[PDB]
Amino acid sequence: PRIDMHSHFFPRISEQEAAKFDANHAPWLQVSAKGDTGSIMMGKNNFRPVYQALWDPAFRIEEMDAQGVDVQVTCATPVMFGYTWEANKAAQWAERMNDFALEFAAHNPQRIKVLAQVPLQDLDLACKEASRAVAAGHLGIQIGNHLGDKDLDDATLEAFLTHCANEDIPILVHPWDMMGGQRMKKWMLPWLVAMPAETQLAILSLILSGAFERIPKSLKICFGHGGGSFAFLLGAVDNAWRHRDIVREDCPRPPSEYVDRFFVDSAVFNPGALELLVSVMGEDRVMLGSDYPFPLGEQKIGGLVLSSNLGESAKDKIISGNASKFFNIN
Amino acid sequence: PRIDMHSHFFPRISEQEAAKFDANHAPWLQVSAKGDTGSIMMGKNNFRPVYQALWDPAFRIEEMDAQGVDVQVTCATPVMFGYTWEANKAAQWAERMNDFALEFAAHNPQRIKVLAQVPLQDLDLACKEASRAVAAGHLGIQIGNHLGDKDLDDATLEAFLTHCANEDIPILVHPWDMMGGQRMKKWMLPWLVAMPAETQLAILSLILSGAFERIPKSLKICFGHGGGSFAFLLGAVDNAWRHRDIVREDCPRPPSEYVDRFFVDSAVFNPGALELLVSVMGEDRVMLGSDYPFPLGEQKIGGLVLSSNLGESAKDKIISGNASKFFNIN
Ligand SMILES: [Zn+2]
Ligand SMILES: [Zn+2]
């Protein structure tokens, strides 16, 4: 079947319910009276216009049919993370969101799988939430790729990964809270420039810090959006490792050898980019992700893989094989 | 014949010559009695230790012999920019670095060419410095993407491109200066992540702002380092342009259609990445650049292009053809 392992949801939360958590920074969902469109709010502010398939599981199915998608793995919209909040409030939030997801998916748990969020600022509460959420349904965890000035090499984030590997919980790493600051507002530049750099930073943070050495090889970790610009700029990285002390210091093998340690989704929107990606990662390590139902995710899901010059077996693993093994969908 | 269009020098200046500009911001060169070592200086502290090839054309002429390199275009180390300085002092400084670059060049003007630097913080001072310098023999200009602490590139910058496009003054745009704030502190991550991003941002800035519609097709502009991650991320840009009216707002054609308006150098350190780059830019708009003499410079200049499953006609254009037309070199 077709397995789309990168999609998003947003739960039914009213302004008042989100107010209890944080009347200013807790997101919620404003739906039209018809019920077809809607907005993600943020206190009183409009954040991002959305539509029915983000909150409605039934309505999501009828698009899951038209696109030929059999099983969808879905998870929190990044605005729900709340990594900057006080920890207990966040842990409570993350528990409530993971509950909403199970509800969402339970409409038809055969086709809709979910991933959990965690209060990643607090290592203890994050591990607790991850175990709890998986035992209760979720097939794994989605996290943002960094926590303020902390990247995946931070010991707190490295310890979370280790915990997930110990308990055989699979992780999807998603870019969010993009760098760039004031210079990238127009033309969705944060999406096009900062977001792939964020992801590539995350991957390189694990590799060059030595982290993969101190993390069990049993960890299932996947990077969204093709690993960003990772696969393309990897040559420049091997070259820096070869010729600079400071680059080599904590990384014992050539950085390129580490593609055996993680996965990437397939959303790179270009036949040749996909072929370089598969070349670097191997057909075993790339999975179909659409970024549904957001405006700039692949509009015909799986379109790019199937239209490619890849072997029938390579097209099968990517569209199905690798995510049945990765998330243990049978 | 063999042309490396991307390299760097630093002038033969003393603590005192530079003192007359600044005691703690104007950089100068210190070399030991064993005239082989050397180090760039700021005040009385080491800013950057330095290979003998960086200053001293004599040694350079010999390394160009060992390498396949007949002609090498060379320019400022971005340390020498000073786009933060007051517009007048930075006009004085600029021209001195361009005289210092003409004495360097006049040690073999058949083999050593020079690009000028401009006081880009003031539009007219820079325009004047530019015309003045190409007239003195410089084959063109090298500019950063900022202003020491700047947000990208407005219509002031677009004017400077127009000035150059009209007097046929070629420009090499060189990624420089940060992006990562308090992140990316180890393993040369700014060079591996932030620098490719900066370059791709410069490119997309020109394209998505519609700038190429106001800029005469006469413009000769090259982007350092393979144009960063541009080629690989292009499919994503195109996808966004077509699914979001804000991306398309100032950009009347698909962004990918604009590849005919600029050049990139070839320094991407990987045959697969170079093959995608050529397939996107076309063999006519990729030139050989090594980043000599820096430690992350290509070791065997030309090596990656020569060794490629590319075409032979393609290989001569890259090595020679394109950079002959671009700088006007015979
Ligand atoms: Zn996503
Ligand atoms: Zn350079």
Side-chain angles (χ1 to χ4, degrees), chain B:
Chain B
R2 202 175 302 201
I3 304 181
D4 171 37
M5 46 74 56
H6 190 169
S7 63
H8 299 294
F9 85 104
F10 187 96
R12 343 193 69 164
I13 305 198
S14 48
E15 176 175 23
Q16 32 200 352
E17 289 183 47
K20 314 187 171 184
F21 286 88
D22 199 298
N24 19 251
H25 274 70
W28 55 276
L29 179 59
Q30 219 204 316
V31 199
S32 117
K34 178 166 293 299
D36 304 312
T37 158
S39 173
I40 292 179
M41 288 295 171
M42 199 51 61
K44 66 166 180 54
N45 33 265
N46 213 72
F47 183 68
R48 222 234 249 266
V50 142
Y51 205 62
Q52 188 196 0
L54 195 59
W55 77 98
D56 161 38
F59 198 23
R60 187 176 294 229
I61 275 311
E62 292 286 76
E63 303 218 27
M64 290 168 64
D65 294 327
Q67 306 292 323
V69 193
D70 303 287
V71 188
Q72 184 186 84
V73 192
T74 197
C75 47
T77 309
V79 190
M80 305 151 44
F81 281 156
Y83 291 165
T84 33
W85 299 3
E86 179 276 326
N88 228 34
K89 227 84 225 300
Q92 308 171 224
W93 176 258
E95 202 198 317
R96 183 73 183 103
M97 310 308 268
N98 301 295
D99 302 331
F100 255 134
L102 281 184
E103 68 152 58
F104 183 91
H107 184 274
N108 210 339
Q110 317 139 22
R111 307 195 79 197
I112 303 158
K113 308 293 184 187
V114 275
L115 298 182
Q117 65 182 258
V118 287
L120 206 60
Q121 58 272 59
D122 179 274
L123 165 80
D124 8 327
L125 283 178
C127 283
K128 271 124 208 288
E129 184 48 64
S131 283
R132 196 251 60 153
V134 165
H138 289 270
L139 292 204
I141 303 286
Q142 180 201 215
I143 64 179
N145 358 92
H146 300 157
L147 222 82
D149 300 287
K150 206 227 171 160
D151 307 325
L152 276 176
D153 67 352
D154 19 74
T156 297
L157 253 16
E158 185 174 335
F160 187 94
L161 299 194
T162 310
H163 169 86
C164 283
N166 280 331
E167 322 221 315
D168 280 60
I169 287 186
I171 311 121
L172 164 69
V173 187
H174 205 277
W176 94 304
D177 190 42
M178 264 67 244
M179 191 202 261
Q182 255 47 234
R183 309 163 62 186
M184 316 186 212
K185 295 288 180 165
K186 308 202 69 199
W187 320 294
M188 297 188 60
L189 282 173
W191 198 245
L192 309 169
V193 175
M195 193 244 76
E198 285 277 1
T199 298
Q200 183 220 17
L201 184 46
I203 294 161
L204 288 196
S205 275
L206 287 185
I207 302 190
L208 297 167
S209 73
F212 279 131
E213 294 283 356
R214 277 93 62 186
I215 299 295
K217 322 218 174 300
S218 81
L219 191 54
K220 272 176 182 182
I221 184 149
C222 183
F223 286 99
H225 307 282
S229 46
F230 174 81
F232 182 80
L233 297 174
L234 188 38
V237 181
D238 269 16
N239 182 255
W241 178 94
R242 139 194 339 149
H243 292 101
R244 285 291 200 109
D245 58 347
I246 36 178
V247 197
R248 153 197 340 156
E249 197 187 351
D250 298 297
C251 191
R253 350 201 151 150
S256 44
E257 200 188 359
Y258 289 79
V259 289
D260 57 25
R261 298 288 317 273
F262 60 97
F263 293 71
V264 295
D265 74 32
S266 55
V268 296
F269 306 91
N270 184 255
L274 172 84
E275 261 189 334
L276 179 136
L277 179 76
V278 156
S279 144
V280 165
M281 290 303 289
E283 27 179 90
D284 276 83
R285 318 196 70 100
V286 187
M287 311 187 277
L288 170 67
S290 66
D291 203 10
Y292 185 81
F294 295 153
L296 284 204
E298 188 180 23
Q299 296 302 125
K300 199 236 282 163
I301 304 168
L304 178 70
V305 191
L306 306 186
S307 50
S308 55
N309 318 283
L310 263 165
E312 289 301 312
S313 61
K315 288 171 212 235
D316 302 286
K317 294 179 164 165
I318 295 167
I319 293 295
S320 228
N322 311 332
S324 290
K325 294 167 281 177
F326 194 100
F327 296 89
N328 203 339
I329 302 176
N330 317 332

Side-chain angles (χ1 to χ4, degrees), chain A residues 6-8 75-76 78 142 172 174-175 191 224-225 265 290-292 294:
Chain A
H6 184 165
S7 62
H8 294 295
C75 56
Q142 164 195 242
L172 183 57
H174 196 293
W191 199 244
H225 306 105
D265 78 29
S290 70
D291 204 350
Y292 171 90
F294 293 149

